[PDB]
């Protein structure tokens, strides 16, 4: 039996949660068991929790968003401190959201900047033209270039991680799905200010799951945004939410969404 504790570090919106979900194969600490290997992924908040996770880490996966022009050119100082104090733990660089890059050859230069020209103890000599606060981390064991959103080559990282292993409520679910749909469809802060209240949850005469959920908001403009033109917006949400539920509980579900102002 082989086990590997891997901790995900990086910027807030570097996609750590997305990559963890893709590795797990489900949108959810996570455990990936395959044959005789067990990989424990520890998702940490973006930059006390990351350091405490490092205290029990066998491998570190440093995610960098290449699409973000502001932060792609350097590793954040706190991340560099984290790696320096735990230099003994192996670290692997993952350049996420490559699909968003228009000119992807840029990646190459970024590597030289992020790895300081050294990877896995070997220098990255590169044909050289015609003749202090650290910016990178020269002790990365390996480099990956992937896009977690499209699952592009996440399988390669999964197989790599498997290789480095060393011998050794339903109402809540429905609320989470509705929250996801609200986030996807509603603008700005509105989906963060919607309170949900389960009104009816029962089994109908035909074996279906009859759900009536109430969407409470503090403002009338939020009600208008929720209902949308001619009731389209809310309607769309319900159907999509219902469709997701079709796959989660494996039955027929009649979900009805009603919007009321918080008094």
């Amino acid at each position: 039996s082989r086990v590997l504790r891997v901790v995900l570090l990086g910027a807030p919106n570097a996609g750590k949660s997305t990559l963890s979900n893709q590795l797990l194969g489900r949108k959810v600490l996570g455990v990936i068991t395959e044959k005789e290997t067990q990989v424990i992924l520890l998702d940490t908040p973006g930059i006390e929790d990351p350091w405490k996770s490092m205290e029990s880490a066998d491998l570190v996966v440093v995610l960098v968003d290449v699409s973000d022009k502001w932060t792609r050119n350097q590793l954040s100082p706190q991340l560099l401190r984290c790696l320096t104090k735990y230099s003994q733990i192996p670290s692997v660089l993952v350049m996420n959201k490559v699909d968003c890059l228009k000119q992807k050859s840029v990646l190459l230069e970024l590597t030289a900047a992020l790895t300081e020209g050294v990877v896995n103890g070997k220098k990255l000599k590169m044909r050289q033209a015609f003749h202090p606060q650290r910016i990178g981390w020269p002790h990365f064991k390996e480099i990956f270039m992937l896009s977690a959103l499209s699952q592009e080559d996440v399988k390669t990282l999964k197989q790599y991680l498997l290789t480095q292993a060393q011998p050794g409520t339903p109402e809540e679910i429905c609320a989470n799905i509705i929250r996801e749909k609200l986030l996807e469809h509603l603008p700005q802060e509105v989906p963060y200010n919607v309170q949900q209240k389960t009104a009816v949850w029962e089994e109908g005469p035909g074996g279906e799951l009859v759900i009536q959920q109430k969407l409470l908001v503090p403002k009338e403009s939020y009600v208008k945004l929720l209902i949308g033109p001619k009731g389209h917006v809310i309607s769309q949400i319900a159907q999509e939410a219902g469709h997701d539920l079709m796959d989660i509980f494996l039955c027929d579900v009649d979900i009805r969404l009603s919007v009321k102002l918080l008094k």
Binding site: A199, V200, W201, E202, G204, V210
Partner: protein, 67 residues
């Protein structure tokens, strides 16, 4: 509609939560909806009807609600 007729008033509440149904579910004209609402509250506060659930003795009465 009488507050003592708990059997009839239980035909208009949720079996699992005891919440009162609306006219879109019950199908009553608004006046009888008001009578049923007031009767249910009167029975609940006078110790005739449960509030957080439907009395199990009346779970097998005819279903007149469109839910």
């Amino acid at each position: 509609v009488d507050y003592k007729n708990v059997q009839l008033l239980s035909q208009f509440v949720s079996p699992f939560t005891g919440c009162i149904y609306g006219r879109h579910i019950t199908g009553l004209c608004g006046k009888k909806q008001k009578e049923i609402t007031k009767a249910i509250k009167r029975a609940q506060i006078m110790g005739f009807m449960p509030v957080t659930y439907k009395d199990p003795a009346y779970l097998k009465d005819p279903k007149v609600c469109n839910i």
